[PDB]
Amino acid sequence: SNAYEPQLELTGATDYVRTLSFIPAAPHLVATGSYDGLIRLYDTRSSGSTPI
Amino acid sequence: FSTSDQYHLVITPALILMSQFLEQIKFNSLKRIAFGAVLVRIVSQYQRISKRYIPEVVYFFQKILLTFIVEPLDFENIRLDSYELGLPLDVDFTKKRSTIIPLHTLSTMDTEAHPVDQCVSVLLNVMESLDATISTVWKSLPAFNEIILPIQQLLSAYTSKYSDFEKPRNILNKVEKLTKFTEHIPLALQNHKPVSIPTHAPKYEDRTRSEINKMKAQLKKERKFTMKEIRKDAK
Amino acid sequence: QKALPASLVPQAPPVLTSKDKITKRMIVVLAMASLETHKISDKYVLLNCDDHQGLLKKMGRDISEARPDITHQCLLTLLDSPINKAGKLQVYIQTSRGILIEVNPTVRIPRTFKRFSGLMVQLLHKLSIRSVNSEEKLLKVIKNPITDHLPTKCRKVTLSFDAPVIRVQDYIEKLDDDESICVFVGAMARGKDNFADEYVDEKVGLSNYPLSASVACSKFCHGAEDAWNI
Amino acid sequence: PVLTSKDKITKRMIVVLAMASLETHKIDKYVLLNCDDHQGLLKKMGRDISEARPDITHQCLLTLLDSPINKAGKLQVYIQTSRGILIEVNPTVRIPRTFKRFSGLMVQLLHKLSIRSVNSEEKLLKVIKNPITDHLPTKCRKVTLSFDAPVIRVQDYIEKLDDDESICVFVGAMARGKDNFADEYVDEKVGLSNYPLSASVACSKFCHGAEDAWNI
Amino acid sequence: THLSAHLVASFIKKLARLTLESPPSAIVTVIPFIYNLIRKHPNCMIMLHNPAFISNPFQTPDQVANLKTLKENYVDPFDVHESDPELTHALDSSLWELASLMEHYHPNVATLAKIFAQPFKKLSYNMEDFLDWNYDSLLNAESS
Amino acid sequence: SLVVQEFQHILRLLNTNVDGNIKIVYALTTIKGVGRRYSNLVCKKADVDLHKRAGELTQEELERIVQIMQNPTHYKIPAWFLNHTLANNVESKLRDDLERLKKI
Amino acid sequence: TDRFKGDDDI
C-alpha cells in the first residue's frame, strides 16, 4: 500500500545478500542467507537492525 | 638536455631503454652488478632533476640485496639469478675502504678479478644511492609503507645476520621516523565537483519564399476588394 | 556499515518546472514589476524611467514607478545564485498590469540593459521565447493565478519592512520536509508593501534597515543555501 | 562613525575590485567603453571586445553598497582598474542605479580626478595612486576569491579571524582571465562553492557571511 | 556471476602490490583489468575511496573531533600472508599502490591512471587491445 | 564457483546509428525507411529468435543480416519491400482588366 | 557550459 518507503529495513549483513526465506509458523521471523555464509535470523517486531 | 619535463623526444626513449636494461638483464657477474649500480646512479640523478617514481628501481634494490646475501625461507619471492656469490662474515667494515669511486671503464675492465673490497664497495654504493632516493622520493610517495616493507625486512635481516654495519642501522632509524611521522589515511580519490544545471541562450531580434507570400497576400487583398466594388456597382 | 551507491558519476539534477508539484524547492515571485510596452511612431519599446519622460508624462504615469532596472538586477542575482546552479528555485515575474511570467531556472539572461529590453518586448508580445538550441521555452507567459501554478504544499510569505525581523536559516530549517517556500519580493521602486495580502500567509523582515530588492533576495537565498547545505 | 583610509585600527572589511574595466574615450565629447554600444570602435583600438564590462562593475558596486553591512558602516570599497588607477569609495555613497548615469558619473570622475558632493564636507570618490597597502589598515588578512582554491565556510573563516584583524577580499571583475592578479599582496585564496560564481553573487555571499558572523 | 566482493577485493589488492613492484608493460595490461572488475562489482568503490573520512564544512566540531580520533586510531587491517581470499580482509584497505602508479613517470601510464582519477565514464576496455604491449613494440611506437 | 556466458552499444549501419536495448525488428525500423513486415521477413530469413535485443546476435549473423539487407536481389526479395510566374501574370491581368472596368 | 560571460551577437 505504502510503496514509497521501506516499512522496515533490515541490515546487519556483510556481503551480497542474495537469498531469503520466511518461516511458516512464525509470521514475523525472517531468515536471510548472505554470501559470506552466516545465515541471519531476524524478528521483525523487534528493532530489526540486528539479527536475533 | 632537460630531463625534468614530462615528455622528451629523446630522453623518454632513453628512459625506457635503461628501464629495459635495468630489468631484463641477468645477474651472473659482478661486472653486470656494477653496470646496474651505475645505471641506478644515473637514474637517481635523472630523478634528482625530475622527481618521479620507478618500481623497477625499487625491485632492483630488492634483487641486488638478496643476490648479495643469498649465501632462503625469508624471501623466496624474488627468483634470483646467481646463488653462489654471497658475502660471509669476513667484512672489515672500515671507513677508509674504497668508496663508490666511479672509474667506469677501469672498473668494468678489472671487475672479474673481484675482491671482497669491491663487493662491499658496490654494496655501499647501492646503499648510499638507496638512502638518497628514499629521502627524495619514497617518503613523498603515499604507498611508502608497503613500498619500503621488503627493503625494511631485508635490512632487518642484515642487522640480525651481522650486527656490525652502521649505514643500514641509520637507514632503519630514518625509515622508522618516516613511518612514525606519516599518518597513512586511506584513499579519497573519487570525490568530485557536483555539476551545475545546464544553461541556454534565448533568441530575439528566404527572399524568394518571402516574395511569393507577399504576392499571394497582394493578390488576395486586391481580388477581394475588386469583387466587393463590382458587387456594389451591380446592386 | 553503509554501502556506496552504484553510480558515483556527477549528474545534473532535473530542471524544476511548473509541471512537477512534488519536489521541495524555493520560488521567488518578483511582484509588482514594471514592464510596459509602448509603440512609438515605427517600433515598440519597453518603458524605462530615465530616457523618455516627456512621453512618459504624456501617458501621465510616474517616472518613479516605471523602473525595470531593479527587476533586471534582481533576475541577475537570482539566476546567478548558487541555488539556481543546484536547481532548487524557480522564478515568476508578476507584472504590475497583471501578467504572470514563468522563468525557467536554465535561462542565461543578457546582462546589458538594451539587450534585456529587446528580450522583454519580444517576450511581452510574442508570449514565448525559445532557446537557441530550440527544444524548450524558457520565458513563458502564464495565466493568473500563481496559486493555480504553485506547488500544492507551499508556504507563501511577503518581504515587508515593518514585520519583525527573523533569521532566514531559522525559518527555512523550521519549515517541514516537503513544505516548499515562496517569497513575495516587492519589485517596486518605492511604495506600499501590501499587494499580496490575499495570496500570502504571513509577512517577514530581514533587517532593521530597508534593503534593495536584489539584496533582500540575495539574503534569503544565501540563508536557504546555508540551511540546505550547499 | 564614517570609516576612511586614515583610520587603520578598527575591525573592518575591505573589498578590492581587481582589473575592473573603467575606461574612457573622447569621440565631439567623452564616452565610456561599453561592450555593446560599440564594436568597430574597439576593433579600431585593437582592444578585445569582451573585456570592457562596466555593467559588471556597476552590479558589484550596487550589491555591495546596498548590502546591510554597508549601511551599518563596516567596509570600504577600492577599485583597481585595468589601467592601474586606484579609486576609493566611502560607505556614504548613493550610487546611481542606472548604467547610463553610472557611466556619466564614472567618466566625470575620470576627467575631474576628484568627486565631492553639493554638501561638500567630505569627498565620495577619490582617485589615488597604486599600491593599495599604503591605504590598507595595519592588521589585514588578505584573501582572493578563486575557483581552483579549496572551499570554505565564511562563518568559520570570520570566526577563525582574530579580534581586531581587519579583512580584505579580492574579486576579479573581468570576464575572462586568470586569477593571478594580486599574488604579490595576498596571503591566501579560497573558494565559495562547487559551482563557478560571478562578481555580484560572490560579494553578496561574502557580505552575508560577514553579516551573520558579526551579528548585524 | 557467483563471486564474492571479498574475492574480487583479494585479487584487486594482490594485483595492486604486484603493480607496486612490476615492470611497466604489466602495468599497461593490469590497470584496465582493475577498472573492469570495479565496473562489474561496483561495491569496491569503498576501497577506491572510503568517504567516511571526507570532512564536510557544514558540520559540527564534535564530528570533526570524531573524524580526528578515527584518523589517529586507524590501522590498515589487510593481511598479505593468508591464502584464503574470503578471509583476507582486503575489503578494508585502499589502493595506495595505484596512487603511486598515478605518480608513475611514463606519460601513457600517467594518463591510464588519470583514468582512475576521473569519474567512471565507460564500461569496457578490450583487454585484448591493451594486452599486446612489449618493450620492442613500445619503442617502435615511440620512435614512430 | 563460476558460471560463464556463451555486449555492444549503438551500432552504425549505412550512415544510420541503431540502438541495442530494443528488439531487432524495431532496430530495422529505426534504420531509415524500411518497414515492419520487411524487417520481420529479413529476421525470419536469417532464422533467428524474434525476441532478442540487438546486444545479442553475434557478428557472424549480424554481417549475414547486413549482407541480406544490402543485396536483396540475391535473396528473392519481392518488390514491395523497397522504398509564382503564373501567379504574377494572373495578378497583373485580372487587376488591370477589372481596373479598366472600375474606370469605365 | 556557459558561465558568466554574457551572450553572443549577430
Side-chain angles (χ1 to χ4, degrees), chain A, chain B, chain C, chain D, chain E, chain F residues 20 27 33 35 46 54-55 72 78-79 87, chain G:
Chain A
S1 313
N2 292 314
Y4 314 115
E5 306 86 2
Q7 179 214 28
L8 191 145
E9 264 173 24
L10 216 63
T11 174
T14 286
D15 192 19
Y16 282 174
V17 173
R18 260 166 182 157
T19 92
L20 86 164
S21 157
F22 303 97
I23 284 173
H28 58 78
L29 207 71
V30 175
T32 312
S34 82
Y35 222 76
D36 62 314
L38 278 302
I39 298 174
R40 271 98 180 182
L41 263 297
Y42 305 90
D43 171 41
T44 43
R45 49 215 174 86
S46 160
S47 88
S49 77
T50 72
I52 292 301
Chain B
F1 278 104
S2 45
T3 307
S4 307
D5 44 58
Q6 285 204 351
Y7 175 53
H8 200 108
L9 286 68
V10 301
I11 296 180
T12 43
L15 306 179
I16 62 192
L17 181 49
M18 46 192 68
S19 310
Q20 168 196 26
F21 289 162
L22 199 73
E23 191 43 61
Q24 284 277 0
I25 68 177
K26 197 173 65 177
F27 288 154
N28 51 1
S29 82
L30 200 57
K31 323 179 63 72
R32 295 172 178 176
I33 286 176
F35 202 62
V38 60
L39 281 162
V40 156
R41 194 58 68 170
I42 187 181
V43 295
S44 66
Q45 182 57 256
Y46 275 38
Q47 284 326 299
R48 286 182 264 281
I49 214 64
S50 301
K51 310 220 149 194
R52 299 166 202 276
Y53 177 90
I54 302 102
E56 259 169 354
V57 178
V58 62
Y59 167 68
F60 202 88
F61 286 157
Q62 265 295 126
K63 207 167 185 172
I64 298 312
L65 294 178
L66 211 59
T67 187
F68 281 167
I69 289 90
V70 55
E71 289 193 353
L73 86 171
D74 185 55
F75 269 91
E76 68 262 0
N77 319 318
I78 312 298
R79 195 196 163 202
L80 279 307
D81 303 355
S82 159
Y83 273 67
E84 57 270 19
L85 54 99
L87 308 97
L89 311 98
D90 73 291
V91 70
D92 62 323
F93 50 86
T94 74
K95 320 312 158 284
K96 62 208 163 300
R97 275 309 109 186
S98 157
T99 190
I100 73 165
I101 186 175
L103 271 74
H104 318 323
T105 53
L106 194 140
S107 315
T108 67
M109 285 315 112
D110 52 27
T111 318
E112 261 195 348
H114 38 275
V116 309
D117 206 329
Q118 206 163 20
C119 311
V120 177
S121 158
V122 59
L123 188 147
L124 272 190
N125 171 47
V126 177
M127 286 295 296
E128 306 322 293
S129 168
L130 167 144
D131 209 344
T133 63
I134 284 172
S135 65
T136 183
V137 163
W138 265 246
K139 68 180 185 180
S140 297
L141 267 290
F144 161 71
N145 210 324
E146 50 261 23
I147 297 177
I148 207 66
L149 200 43
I151 303 308
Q152 207 271 349
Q153 291 203 331
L154 285 197
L155 195 163
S156 46
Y158 278 17
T159 295
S160 44
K161 153 79 184 188
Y162 284 118
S163 50
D164 60 359
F165 264 57
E166 284 52 50
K167 173 62 59 183
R169 186 79 151 85
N170 309 139
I171 291 183
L172 183 144
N173 309 124
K174 207 192 73 173
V175 307
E176 206 283 326
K177 87 175 62 86
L178 285 180
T179 180
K180 209 259 181 177
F181 204 92
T182 41
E183 73 289 324
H184 196 43
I185 281 306
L187 267 182
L189 181 54
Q190 204 78 5
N191 168 43
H192 300 61
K193 321 294 296 290
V195 75
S196 43
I197 197 166
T199 78
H200 286 330
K203 163 210 299 180
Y204 60 95
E205 56 97 9
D206 209 336
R207 307 286 296 181
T208 299
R209 188 179 81 174
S210 88
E211 281 308 304
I212 286 172
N213 300 341
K214 292 327 167 190
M215 287 326 281
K216 291 241 197 185
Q218 287 287 327
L219 168 68
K220 157 159 191 170
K221 175 185 194 178
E222 314 194 33
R223 201 265 327 278
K224 204 170 169 176
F225 166 58
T226 49
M227 198 96 62
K228 284 166 189 185
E229 182 56 13
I230 281 188
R231 291 180 184 179
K232 271 186 207 151
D233 296 11
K235 295 200 160 195
Chain C
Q1 76 277 355
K2 187 167 181 178
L4 289 199
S7 290
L8 291 181
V9 309
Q11 274 165 343
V15 192
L16 300 187
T17 43
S18 44
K19 284 313 169 193
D20 206 0
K21 301 203 148 209
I22 314 180
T23 305
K24 186 193 181 199
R25 65 174 67 91
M26 195 165 78
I27 295 96
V28 178
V29 284
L30 317 166
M32 269 294 197
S34 65
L35 304 165
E36 196 278 347
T37 298
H38 192 70
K39 179 187 184 305
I40 67 171
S41 289
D42 201 352
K43 198 42 185 177
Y44 328 102
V45 58
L46 155 69
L47 279 181
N48 188 0
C49 76
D50 60 69
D51 193 16
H52 299 291
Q53 291 155 279
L55 199 166
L56 200 166
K57 166 170 54 186
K58 186 264 291 180
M59 263 85 70
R61 306 191 174 274
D62 296 1
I63 310 96
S64 57
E65 275 176 346
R67 274 170 54 188
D69 293 343
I70 54 176
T71 87
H72 181 219
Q73 55 207 14
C74 274
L75 210 70
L76 262 294
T77 180
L78 272 174
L79 295 184
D80 278 347
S81 313
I83 197 167
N84 178 79
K85 315 267 197 171
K88 282 267 195 172
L89 93 166
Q90 60 175 359
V91 303
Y92 298 88
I93 293 146
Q94 185 153 351
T95 323
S96 70
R97 305 301 308 159
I99 315 295
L100 212 65
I101 288 181
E102 156 189 353
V103 178
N104 191 291
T106 194
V107 70
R108 176 77 216 179
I109 320 154
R111 307 171 68 99
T112 168
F113 185 68
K114 45 194 68 61
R115 280 196 211 163
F116 173 70
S117 298
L119 194 78
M120 203 41 57
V121 56
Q122 180 91 327
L123 168 67
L124 278 168
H125 269 237
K126 190 64 68 177
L127 294 165
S128 313
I129 287 180
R130 277 183 194 79
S131 44
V132 299
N133 307 144
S134 161
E135 70 271 359
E136 201 166 7
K137 287 182 283 186
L138 322 168
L139 308 172
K140 210 202 301 192
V141 163
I142 64 172
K143 164 184 215 317
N144 308 327
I146 187 66
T147 76
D148 200 2
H149 309 293
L150 271 193
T152 312
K153 193 168 204 47
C154 167
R155 293 288 275 275
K156 312 191 197 75
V157 291
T158 319
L159 275 195
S160 65
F161 160 70
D162 217 340
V165 52
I166 51 154
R167 189 179 67 190
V168 58
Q169 309 150 37
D170 195 344
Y171 197 76
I172 290 297
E173 278 190 314
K174 193 53 188 170
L175 280 190
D176 201 75
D177 283 338
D178 66 327
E179 194 159 301
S180 277
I181 182 61
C182 166
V183 287
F184 283 74
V185 168
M188 299 155 295
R190 196 205 172 203
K192 294 303 292 174
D193 46 354
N194 44 8
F195 44 81
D197 292 332
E198 73 266 17
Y199 276 120
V200 297
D201 293 18
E202 57 186 359
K203 299 193 164 188
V204 289
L206 299 185
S207 87
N208 303 324
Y209 318 101
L211 291 85
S212 177
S214 43
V215 194
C217 294
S218 315
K219 174 156 187 174
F220 206 99
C221 164
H222 289 330
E225 294 172 356
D226 175 91
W228 298 341
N229 315 325
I230 302 182
Chain D
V2 172
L3 260 58
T4 183
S5 45
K6 322 305 301 182
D7 198 340
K8 291 182 180 188
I9 297 102
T10 64
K11 188 180 206 163
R12 49 180 82 90
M13 207 193 58
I14 300 93
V15 302
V16 184
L17 303 203
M19 309 328 296
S21 297
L22 279 299
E23 305 91 341
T24 174
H25 190 61
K26 197 185 202 306
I27 315 300
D28 207 70
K29 275 300 294 176
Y30 299 113
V31 59
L32 208 70
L33 269 299
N34 174 270
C35 82
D36 189 288
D37 185 67
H38 40 90
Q39 284 80 3
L41 189 142
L42 277 299
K43 193 49 54 196
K44 169 45 194 181
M45 298 215 187
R47 276 77 166 262
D48 187 75
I49 177 61
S50 84
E51 304 303 281
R53 290 180 90 173
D55 45 10
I56 307 177
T57 79
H58 190 192
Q59 299 298 135
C60 205
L61 310 182
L62 262 174
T63 299
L64 264 178
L65 264 74
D66 308 329
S67 162
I69 188 155
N70 176 66
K71 273 166 150 221
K74 282 270 199 172
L75 66 95
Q76 44 202 0
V77 182
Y78 305 152
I79 295 95
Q80 191 291 325
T81 182
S82 309
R83 293 265 301 173
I85 294 99
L86 170 56
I87 302 98
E88 208 288 330
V89 191
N90 316 116
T92 79
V93 174
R94 296 155 61 187
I95 195 71
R97 328 204 61 84
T98 318
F99 178 78
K100 282 306 177 181
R101 317 193 175 191
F102 169 76
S103 172
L105 180 147
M106 294 325 294
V107 64
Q108 279 300 109
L109 165 80
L110 290 202
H111 302 332
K112 191 176 178 181
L113 281 297
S114 194
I115 280 299
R116 218 190 308 174
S117 83
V118 74
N119 183 299
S120 306
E121 188 278 333
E122 172 266 0
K123 279 175 288 171
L124 295 182
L125 319 179
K126 200 167 309 188
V127 191
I128 54 184
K129 185 188 56 53
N130 298 165
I132 327 295
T133 68
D134 48 356
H135 319 306
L136 264 73
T138 72
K139 199 187 302 293
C140 289
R141 196 59 163 81
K142 296 166 278 295
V143 203
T144 310
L145 297 201
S146 184
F147 168 67
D148 304 359
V151 72
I152 58 150
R153 176 161 173 83
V154 282
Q155 289 277 124
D156 313 342
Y157 198 41
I158 303 309
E159 277 155 354
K160 281 190 299 182
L161 259 178
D162 306 352
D163 209 319
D164 56 343
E165 177 165 32
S166 192
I167 179 59
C168 195
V169 75
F170 282 70
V171 303
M174 74 297 285
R176 41 180 48 88
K178 198 51 53 194
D179 61 292
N180 42 43
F181 35 82
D183 318 281
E184 53 270 56
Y185 312 130
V186 70
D187 308 284
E188 76 181 4
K189 305 173 154 301
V190 291
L192 269 299
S193 90
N194 311 324
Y195 319 99
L197 291 196
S198 156
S200 60
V201 75
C203 54
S204 156
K205 173 84 175 184
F206 197 82
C207 72
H208 285 315
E211 278 145 25
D212 184 39
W214 295 340
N215 318 330
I216 313 188
Chain E
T1 82
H2 297 260
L3 315 171
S4 286
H6 285 248
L7 265 291
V8 191
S10 279
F11 291 159
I12 278 176
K13 192 64 168 188
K14 211 74 156 192
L15 281 185
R17 260 181 171 89
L18 299 186
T19 56
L20 204 65
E21 320 177 0
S22 155
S25 45
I27 307 295
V28 170
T29 49
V30 71
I31 48 174
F33 179 71
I34 299 295
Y35 184 91
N36 278 124
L37 287 195
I38 297 176
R39 194 63 164 160
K40 259 160 51 196
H41 312 72
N43 214 353
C44 309
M45 210 66 75
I46 182 167
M47 81 181 73
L48 200 39
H49 82 285
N50 197 327
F53 290 117
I54 290 300
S55 86
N56 283 318
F58 295 113
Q59 40 87 28
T60 171
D62 189 330
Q63 299 274 11
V64 184
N66 299 143
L67 191 81
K68 291 312 155 302
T69 44
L70 201 50
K71 281 169 162 198
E72 56 204 283
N73 300 334
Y74 174 75
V75 53
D76 191 68
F78 180 63
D79 195 337
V80 64
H81 291 289
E82 184 42 65
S83 193
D84 209 359
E86 210 199 354
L87 271 293
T88 46
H89 318 261
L91 198 64
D92 287 4
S93 307
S94 311
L95 305 191
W96 305 287
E97 295 87 322
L98 263 178
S100 313
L101 268 298
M102 182 56 152
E103 201 69 1
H104 195 73
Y105 69 95
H106 189 90
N108 310 138
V109 176
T111 71
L112 269 294
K114 294 147 204 150
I115 212 66
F116 270 67
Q118 282 161 330
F120 280 67
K121 178 57 75 76
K122 49 193 183 321
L123 73 159
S124 313
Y125 275 160
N126 212 3
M127 291 191 55
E128 296 156 12
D129 183 311
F130 271 61
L131 185 63
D132 43 271
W133 289 85
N134 208 340
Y135 286 163
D136 196 328
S137 45
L138 60 93
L139 261 296
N140 300 6
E142 181 60 273
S143 66
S144 46
Chain G
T1 51
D2 278 319
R3 32 183 297 263
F4 183 37
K5 308 163 322 302
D7 211 359
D8 296 332
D9 286 310
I10 305 93

